Amino acid sequence: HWGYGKHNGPEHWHKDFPIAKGERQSPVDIDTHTAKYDPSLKPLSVSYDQATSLRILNNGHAFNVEFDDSQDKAVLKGGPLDGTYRLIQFHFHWGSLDGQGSEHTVDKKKYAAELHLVHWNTKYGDFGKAVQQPDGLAVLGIFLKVGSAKPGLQKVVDVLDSIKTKGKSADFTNFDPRGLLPESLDYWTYPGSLTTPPLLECVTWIVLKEPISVSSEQVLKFRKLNFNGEGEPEELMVDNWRPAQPLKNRQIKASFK
Ligand SMILES: CN(Cc1ccccc1)C(=S)S
Numbered sequence: 001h002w003g004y005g006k007h008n009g010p011e012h013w014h015k016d017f018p019i020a021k022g023e024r025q026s027p028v029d030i031d032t033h034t035a036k037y038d039p040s041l042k043p044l045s046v047s048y049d050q051a052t053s054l055r056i057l058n059n060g061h062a063f064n065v066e067f068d069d070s071q072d073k074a075v076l077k078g079g080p081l082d083g084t085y086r087l088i089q090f091h092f093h094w095g096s097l098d099g100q101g102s103e104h105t106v107d108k109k110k111y112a113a114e115l116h117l118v119h120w121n122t123k124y125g126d127f128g129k130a131v132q133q134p135d136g137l138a139v140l141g142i143f144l145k146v147g148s149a150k151p152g153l154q155k156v157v158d159v160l161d162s163i164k165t166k167g168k169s170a171d172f173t174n175f176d177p178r179g180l181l182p183e184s185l186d187y188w189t190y191p192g193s194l195t196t197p198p199l200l201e202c203v204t205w206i207v208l209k210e211p212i213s214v215s216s217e218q219v220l221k222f223r224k225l226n227f228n229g230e231g232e233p234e235e236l237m238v239d240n241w242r243p244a245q246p247l248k249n250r251q252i253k254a255s256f257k
């Protein structure tokens with residue numbers, strides 16, 4: 001099965017998922033000097049006040065904090081988006097070292113991790129149908145750098161002991177994802193894909209310019225997770241990121257000058 005190891009990592013994925021070499025794959029490098037400011041891009045609207053988190057799951061390649069997406073409770077709208085996109089889950093990608101871990105890069109700079117807040121277009125009725133559509137998903141990507149702690153992340157860090165291994169889940173209610181957002185909503189946007197198999201080309205990427213800072217202790221706790229199941233040989237869940245893919249026939253747009 002696919003993974004992030006030597007024999008099943010990103011360079012292998014195309015054998016089971018040929019779209020890996022497609023025309024709108026993610027992540028990409030964001031060349032800040034060639035991104036074009038688009039004055040017609042609307043401000044992003046992030047409406048998370050009624051978000052209802054349900055649980056947290058180690059799925060063998062990341063941990064997902066899952067939300068009730070059966071009503072319009074936590075939605076993303078505006079920006080490059082037409083219509084309303086509902087929050088279904090968030091997860092992170094991170095490194096074995098503070099010098100790598102993000103999937104998008106900024107002028108080739110790698111951050112220590114990257115948060116993906118995953119939303120699906122309500123016109124398609126559920127996530128599974130949405131991923132089959134070119135405008136099915138909107139993923140808000142936020143870079144993490146190591147420095148000061150992010151207090152709003154700590155409840156996530158502290159439950160990771162309970163989901164160390166693949167397939168473990170824990171109740172995780174009343175978590176407020178507003179505590180993971182930077183001050184500014186300035187962003188870059190482009191059409192791309194999921195960054196894990198099945199690599200479907202269904203994502204409008206909205207990548208925030210401003211990173212959040214997390215502490216070294218916080219990211220160290222991410223690195224104690226396991227890719228394996230309980231009772232299987234221990235392999236630390238680190239470097240669960242795909243490298244940058246060719247931009248091909250795409251232009252990254254900026255919401256800011
Ligand atoms: C939705 N995904 C794929 C994914 C699903 C679960 C955990 C990690 C990644 C994107 S990378 S935004």
Ligand SMILES: [Zn+2]
Pocket residue numbers: 091092093116195
């Ligand atoms: Zn992701």
